[PDB]
Design an enzyme around this catalytic site. Structure first.
Site, PDB file in Angstrom:
ATOM      1  CG  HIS A 126      -2.125  -0.913   1.031  1.00  0.00           C
ATOM      2  ND1 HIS A 126      -3.146  -0.988   1.953  1.00  0.00           N
ATOM      3  CD2 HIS A 126      -2.441  -1.788   0.048  1.00  0.00           C
ATOM      4  CE1 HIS A 126      -4.041  -1.869   1.544  1.00  0.00           C
ATOM      5  NE2 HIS A 126      -3.636  -2.370   0.391  1.00  0.00           N
ATOM      6  NE  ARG A 405      -7.645  -5.732  -2.502  1.00  0.00           N
ATOM      7  CZ  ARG A 405      -7.638  -4.504  -1.993  1.00  0.00           C
ATOM      8  NH1 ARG A 405      -8.233  -4.261  -0.831  1.00  0.00           N
ATOM      9  NH2 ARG A 405      -7.030  -3.518  -2.642  1.00  0.00           N
ATOM     10  CD  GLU A 515     -11.176  -1.139   3.156  1.00  0.00           C
ATOM     11  OE1 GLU A 515     -10.995  -1.301   1.930  1.00  0.00           O
ATOM     12  OE2 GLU A 515     -10.238  -1.097   3.982  1.00  0.00           O
ATOM     13  CG  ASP A 552     -12.597   2.660   1.518  1.00  0.00           C
ATOM     14  OD1 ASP A 552     -11.824   3.635   1.425  1.00  0.00           O
ATOM     15  OD2 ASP A 552     -12.627   1.736   0.682  1.00  0.00           O
ATOM     16  NE  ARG A 590      -7.107  -3.145  14.219  1.00  0.00           N
ATOM     17  CZ  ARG A 590      -7.414  -4.353  14.680  1.00  0.00           C
ATOM     18  NH1 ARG A 590      -6.662  -5.398  14.357  1.00  0.00           N
ATOM     19  NH2 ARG A 590      -8.470  -4.517  15.467  1.00  0.00           N
ATOM     20  NE  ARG A 715      -7.703   4.477  -5.603  1.00  0.00           N
ATOM     21  CZ  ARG A 715      -7.868   3.328  -6.252  1.00  0.00           C
ATOM     22  NH1 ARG A 715      -8.277   2.245  -5.600  1.00  0.00           N
ATOM     23  NH2 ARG A 715      -7.620   3.259  -7.555  1.00  0.00           N
TER      24      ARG A 715
END
Lengths: 890, 890
Positions: A126, A405, A515, A552, A590, A715
């Site tokens: 990320h 994913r 999420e 989110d 997290r 985002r």
């Protein structure tokens, strides 16, 4: 001692850019000191006035200076923490002692629960790691030097040589361009993630298990933690998460899987020769005797000159050397095979010559261990061989299991193409019921679905090809298939079908990712509906994993409402799983920042509802947190320490369950919080306008951190980034003000009940304490400066309204926690970078300062900059440095 | 603190063999303590009585016990020395300060002399390393544990884990068969030698040079030691010395050369990626800019997936990364090529793709250094890049240059075959003159000598094939061709001819080895006769190396006479070289034991005649001394420290030249010494008889240390071994008694002149002090025990005669040194092993105790033993342990 770094660095800065610039940096430091002391908001303008004069190169050098000073402050802080902790001659030993004394739990209970406990740390790419890797190495060297200095065993010449070393390493860091000039590829992200293994994790895991053994012996448990006991595991998303990232192609996933496999093979191969040298005993069982004689039969009496050591046929006098010699052979061929498979598209190395099983590898080492124990050599077995055993049973043949994913809508696109080409309807248009029945009939049927001639899009072919790549690769190289935007059982069953139909030999587990707040609210019903399908419940084998996102949730609704709904979600998902006799393991997405569900790890684990882990936990580690928790031996140890201790306590020491008055109270409080949040972030029509001006949000993409190319539609990472840079932290504290004020308004005894809740309910205590920390890192004068410099004269009071709520909310927080060691200082550097970022943002959003070979000075480093020559670099430097000082990006 | 090891080990011994055996070991310890205290010779028999009772396995365990206790004593001694030295917060800094203060020498003189100074350490596989490598590793781990314990920063759990670690490592060492059951191959010897590189030397050399830089900066010399300055070098004999060792075949020499080359390539390759990560600057010269642009032109835009890191084409933004990336490419291909060349007989890797030159490698790194210095980054350049530069310019493409040694008679056999097959006479029968003329005519002629059809013996073909192997291999992989038993220029010229005729592209230097006293006496005349040949003096290029052996000199003549003649030899060889304008570098074949010219290194260097080194020294390191001086970081540093400091001092601080009265006095004294020595070791006809009984000489070959399959005709190594085991040290002190007594007898003022000589002449002071040390390690009661137990009743008084001379000689030694901190103790263990060795030798030389599957106990470890089951192992263990305690084998 804080003065030390200042002294050394400023000496180097003068040696690199002259007295004049060092003096100007000192002036900025003094003004910032008067601001973080006297807190006069005039001092900020006084400082900016000094910032305006700077030449284009000089401003770059100033941002560089405060950035590196902040980094050095981080390193000195880490060293001082490690030493201040080491000079004591939660915590594992303390946790055990408290579990025995407080709760009357016995040692064998702690050992039993610890054996069956698992903690799956999954690393993500990320884009939250601001510092480039080329500079991260230099930081590691510098903290090595500072660690060796902060000690009293310095021999004068050693101290002088470390002086020269630290000086040259600072000069090397400062002489590197800190700006990524092109964004990385996914393979680069996976490299940056896996670097922590062949540097810290690989040796850190056995050391940690050894320490656990020591504590267990300090409780009276002579027994040791089983080598195959899975106390810690590692998964990865690097090269697997393709959600909204088209650059993660199937060939990327192949690449990262072959990559990790070759790294593992190399590490084992480097270990195995030294292990062979140590196992020089001559006593073994009849068992190991027979096996070693077997190997010596097919010993291949040859030169075997490709090895350096032990190139002669190993005699049966040393049987452990025989067996481990075979382990070396299969390791050499495993490494050479993965190396060719990666380098070319194929390998001639026979598969029967390699290690194909997770425990074909383990079998010979297990035999060596049984042998050593039988012959009285259990101490020898519990050494390098035990370290190696744990390394194999923890890292396997491929250091990390990779997750895949993908958003559900892509699977829906595929299935729709399949039904339309089959002329049976349109899967998109179909209702849920129909999709469930159809997917079930195809899953239980035996006829192939699509064929070679199925019309596919680049997207459809992307996902289908990812399934084929998964089919081609070994099953122990993959983890879970995570579905983004999962809402119904049809989304899971679509993945099970697409897997079976793409000839996935051993299909990996499917896991839904809830999420957004709407999806968390309805998650238990959906999981229960999935478990209601007997066909799926019979194949799930009593175990189910479901992911729970944190990013989110606190973005569209309040942070308080999001946290509370998360707790409710976990609680009712456990209720569902218990209702269907399924072992549920929940996957917590997290972040590093509290805004994305971050915070201290043990506090986040304590804030989970009781009886929701049960010796099975799965947590992501967002990019920057990888460096935060694994860049040093001590950091890695404190990390695994924190995780395993928190899980064990949450297993044997359940947190208090909320009283029903607290349930209703938090429901009301959450309603008020959400209305208060959406009032200012969505109802206000000018809010998006004010946001795109008062925060540096828009410029985030300029850092080129990740490989991924209205406010509801952005985002969460740059959302928390924007309010963290401005040090306002709106998404952290917004709803709390109106929530609390409404709860004391409706009833005055609710103040006594809030005081009651803060001192007994762990979830509430952690929530409030986190908000208090974030307030401890905030200063509304910064947001005031950004407004005054960048927001139009019109909606200036809007920010002041926010500034009002800020203080108001803070007053309430301390009123619940009952509050009213002297680090500060670093906020001076941070303030300097704040002012620089504001004025630089003002000069960037203008027309005069816009655009209409080698490099030998900083200004020539950006030749393709749409903004003025020296400006863009200065802005990126400000973001980097401010992120470093706050120890958080997004 | 001495009690610590005893406590821990005896705890483990009881945990492995019971209380009974631990108590018996304790009893032996107490009797030995009463012997090393009260010195009653009855105590020895009292101890042996206890030794007789022992079962066959128990005696093995007892010898094992005292052996490992001695080893642990060695390790504790090393740790205590390293710490006692480190807690001071000759020597380099002290040597510099003394050179400035005492001798008025200036810093730039010290720096200049230090730049042009060279120390060539050559490692030998001489069979003096008693402990097997499999156990040497365990020793290294144990000393790591003991070093980490001897400190005050122990955190309780760390101390406990080191306790468990040390316990399991002791148990692992004790659980290995310490007995080599087959003698090694030459390749194994070369592996054991080269292991110290990729463990200590490789990182030790750059650290040492950095410390030298620190000292030079402590004298005011801001300049640094040149990276290409050859302050230290390494050569090897492993796989090259074939003198009397037919197992060193030509294929062995090929093997060890390819081996060392592949090791070097691997080390550089492991270094180069991390160096690439650090050199991330963007400033360079126009020079490095141009070169990096050149590399980026032929950048090969490819996947380049065989690497893990930096598999993408490196951008020109970071030019150092471009250049070092090319260095990585040529390193990868160098490593793969040497790996195939070793594994198979050939490689397809192109030579143009590899590093073929010693400094094709150096050129890019030199460019990077010039670049960093020009751009102001000299601190960065003086870091990892400087370490790497020094590593390249010190270890080159093949870690060590290999020497070849061969006895002259083999070259004579070859040439004789060549002249007989050519029908021109017999080179053997030819006089020296004729040989010189013939060899000269062939060396200056252009017609080939022998052909394919030359009749050769296995010996002749052995040497010819060694020359062909030398021709096939790279020139920078070889060192010198040393001629054993060299007497005439014809022996050297024969080697020059055989080299040229075997198409040796770049012929290596030839060097004569004068080791026997007769050859040292006539060495200067012979070297002068060689320099008289103008053809040879013109090709030698003003530089000549000649080897000077120390082992055999003190064997046929007295130790005193041998040392003195060695001094004379060096002195007159320097006179010859100065007479012919040739830079002479002398190659000192020194041993570890004083009997073979060993002793403290700085004392041996001080005892060399002045103006005989001149910044060029070459010394062997005999097998066991490799471990003694390079098994740890501190040991390696103290070694290079000692060597370079001693050479620099001997260059700027010349030792006093002997007064002429001292010359004549030492001549007379040497005559008396030699007569006294040969009187007892050659004139006595029963001496060889008494020797083969009173010493364990005959059994030396049972240790299987090396790969090499009357008393005048034995090797010097077991000669010093025999008298060192019995702790009598006859070859160390023999002649001194009669020498001194005759010198005070002839003149009484010669006592005042001996006192004068000991306080002013370094050679004499060192000689006497060494003899005093050897007396400090001797005990005639041991030799008395060996006589009483093994020597026939007849010539018992013979040993007593020797025992007389011993004490007599010792009385004289202290009378010259003017002599009359409390370590002792270890002599208790040593005494126990002495008694055990004597009684075991008695039971071995009998008829009753002679000879007429897996193993699960110590007695089954020797199934093919001509002696009784448990006896041979006990004897070998006694030799090993006694050698360990005295820290010397032979």
């Amino acid at each position: 001692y804080d003065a030390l770094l200042l002294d050394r660095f400023l000496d180097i800065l003068q040696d690199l850019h002259g007295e004049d610039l060092r003096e100007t940096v000192q002036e900025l430091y003094e003004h910032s000191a008067e601001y973080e002391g006297k807190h006069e908001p005039k001092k900020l303008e006084e400082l900016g006035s000094v910032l305006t004069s700077l030449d284009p190169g000089d401003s770059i050098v100033i941002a560089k200076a405060f950035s590196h000073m902040l980094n050095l402050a981080n390193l000195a802080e880490e060293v001082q923490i490690a030493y201040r902790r080491r000079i004591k001659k939660s915590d594992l030993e303390e946790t055990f002692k408290k579990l025995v004394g407080d709760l009357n739990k016995s040692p064998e209970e702690i050992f039993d629960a610890l054996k069956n406990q698992t903690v799956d740390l999954v690393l993500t790419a990320h884009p939250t790691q601001s510092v480039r890797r080329s500079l991260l190495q230099k930081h590691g060297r510098i903290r090595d030097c500072l660690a060796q200095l902060y000690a009293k065993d310095i021999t004068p010449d050693d101290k002088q040589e470390l002086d020269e070393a630290l000086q040259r390493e600072i000069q090397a860091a400062f002489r590197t361009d800190e700006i990524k000039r092109t964004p990385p590829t996914p393979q680069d992200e996976m490299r940056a993630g896996m670097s922590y293994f062949h540097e810290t994790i690989w040796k850190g895991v056995p050391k940690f298990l050894r320490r656990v053994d020591t504590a267990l012996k300090n409780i009276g448990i002579e027994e040791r933690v089983p080598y195959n006991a899975p106390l810690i595991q590692f998964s990865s998303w690097m090269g697997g998460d393709r959600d909204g990232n088209p650059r993660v192609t199937p060939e990327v996933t192949r690449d990262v899987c072959l990559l990790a496999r070759m790294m593992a093979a190399t590490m084992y191969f480097n270990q195995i020769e030294d292990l062979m040298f140590e196992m020089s005993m001559w006593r073994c069982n009849d068992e190991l005797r027979a096996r070693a004689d077997e190997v010596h039969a097919n010993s291949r009496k040859d030169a075997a000159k490709h090895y350096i050591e032990f190139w002669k046929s190993i005699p049966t006098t040393e049987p452990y050397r025989v067996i481990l010699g075979d382990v070396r052979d299969k390791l050499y061929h495993t490494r050479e095979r993965a190396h060719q498979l990666l380098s070319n598209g194929h390998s001639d190395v026979p598969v029967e010559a390699t290690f194909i099983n997770l425990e074909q590898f383990l079998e010979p080492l297990e035999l060596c261990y049984r042998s050593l124990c039988s012959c009285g050599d259990r101490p020898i077995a519990d050494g390098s061989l035990l370290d190696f055993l744990r390394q194999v049973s923890t890292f396997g043949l491929s250091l990390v299991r990779l997750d895949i994913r993908q958003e559900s809508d892509r699977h829906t696109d595929v299935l729709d193409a399949i039904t339309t080409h089959l002329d049976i309807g349109s899967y998109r248009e179909w209702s849920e019921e129909r999709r469930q029945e159809w997917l079930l009939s195809e899953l239980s049927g035996k006829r192939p679905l699509f064929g070679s001639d199925l019309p596919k899009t680049e997207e459809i072919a992307d996902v289908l090809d990812t399934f084929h790549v998964i089919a081609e690769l070994p099953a122990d190289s993959f983890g879970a298939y995570i579905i983004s935007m999962a809402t119904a059982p049809s989304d899971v069953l679509a993945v099970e079908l697409l897997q079976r139909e793409c000839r996935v030999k051993q299909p990996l587990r499917v896991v839904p990712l809830f999420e957004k707040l709407a999806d968390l609210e309805a998650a238990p019903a959906a999981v229960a509906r999935l478990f209601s399908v007997d066909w799926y419940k019979n194949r799930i084998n009593g175990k189910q994993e479901v992911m729970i996102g944190y990013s989110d949730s606190g973005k569209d609704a309040g942070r308080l409402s999001a946290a509370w709904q998360l707790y409710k979600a976990q609680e009712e998902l456990v209720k569902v799983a218990k209702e269907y006799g399924v072992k549920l393991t929940m996957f917590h997405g997290r972040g590093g920042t509290v805004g994305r569900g971050g915070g201290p790890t043990h506090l986040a684990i304590l804030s989970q509802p009781p009886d929701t882990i049960n010796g099975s936990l799965r947590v992501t580690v967002q990019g920057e947190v990888i460096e935060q928790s694994f860049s040093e031996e001590h950091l890695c140890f404190r990390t695994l320490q924190r995780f395993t201790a928190a899980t064990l306590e949450h297993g044997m020491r359940p947190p208090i369950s909320p009283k029903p008055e607290w349930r209703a109270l938090l429901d009301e409080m959450a309603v008020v919080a959400t209305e208060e949040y959406r009032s200012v972030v969505f109802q206000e029509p000018r809010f998006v306008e004010y946001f795109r001006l008062a925060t540096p949000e828009l410029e985030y993409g300029r850092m080129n951190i990740g490989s991924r190319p209205g406010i509801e539609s952005l985002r969460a990472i740059p959302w928390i980034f924007a309010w963290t840079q401005t040090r306002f932290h709106l998404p952290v504290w917004l709803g709390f003000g109106s929530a609390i004020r409404h709860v004391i308004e409706k009833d005055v005894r609710n103040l006594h009940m809030l005081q009651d809740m803060y001192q007994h309910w762990p979830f509430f205590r952690v929530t409030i304490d986190l908000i208090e920390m974030v307030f401890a890192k905030g200063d509304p004068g910064i947001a005031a400066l950004y407004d005054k410099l960048l927001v139009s004269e019109e909606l200036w009071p809007f920010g002041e309204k926010l500034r009002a709520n800020f203080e108001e909310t803070k007053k309430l927080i301390l009123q619940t926690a009952g509050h009213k060691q002297r680090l500060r200082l670093r906020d001076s550097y941070i303030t300097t970078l704040n002012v620089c970022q504001a004025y630089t943002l003002k000069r960037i959003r203008d027309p005069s300062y816009h655009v209409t070979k080698p490099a030998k000075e900083l200004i020539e480093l950006n030749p393709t900059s749409e903004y003025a020559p020296g400006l863009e670099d200065t802005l990126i430097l400000t973001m980097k440095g401010i992120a470093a000082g706050l120890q958080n990006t997004g």
